[PDB]
């Protein structure tokens, strides 16, 4: 399986939201920034080189969150919690940005795959 990362950026209980903007079926639903491992990459590499490329930010990449999705037979996604190092978030490629807290995450109109990770980002929010 091809790896597809993804980071929840937490900072003092609010998470970064980053709304797509494309293609049509995802664009105005909102995500975990990340993308795909090339090869030779750790997660980590993979995740960090991500989030410098679509939020102009350095993050410390730290534990999984939530269960990996299935995205198909050839492609797994997994969510990564990680810390701001360095750098203050700008879309590049997203439509909007967003830092949400724990009463808001459930309300979000989120992309397909990354739904069942609701409980579990507000629960990392909650401390719980």
């Keep these: 399986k091809q790896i597809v990362v993804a980071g929840a950026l937490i900072s003092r209980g ?3 939201v980053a709304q797509r903007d494309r293609p049509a079926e995802l664009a105005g ?6 993308g795909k491992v090339t090869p ?5 590499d993979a995740l960090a080189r991500e989030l410098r490329e679509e939020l102009g930010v350095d993050v410390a ?10 995205l198909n037979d050839a492609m797994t996604l997994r969510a990564y919690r990680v810390t701001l190092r ?11 940005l967003r830092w949400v807290g724990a009463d808001e995450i ?5 992309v397909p795959a990354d739904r069942a990770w ?11």
């Design 61 to 70: 990449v730290g534990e999984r969150l939530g269960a990996d999705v299935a």
């Design 40 to 44: 030779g990459e750790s997660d980590a």
């Design 86 to 96: 360095s750098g203050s978030p700008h879309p590049h490629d997203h439509r909007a």
């Design 118 to 128: 609701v409980p579990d980002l507000v629960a990392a929010l909650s401390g719980r």
């Design 29 to 34: 639903l909102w995500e975990l920034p990340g």
């Design 106 to 110: 459930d309300g979000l109109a989120w």
């Design 14 to 16: 609010t998470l970064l």
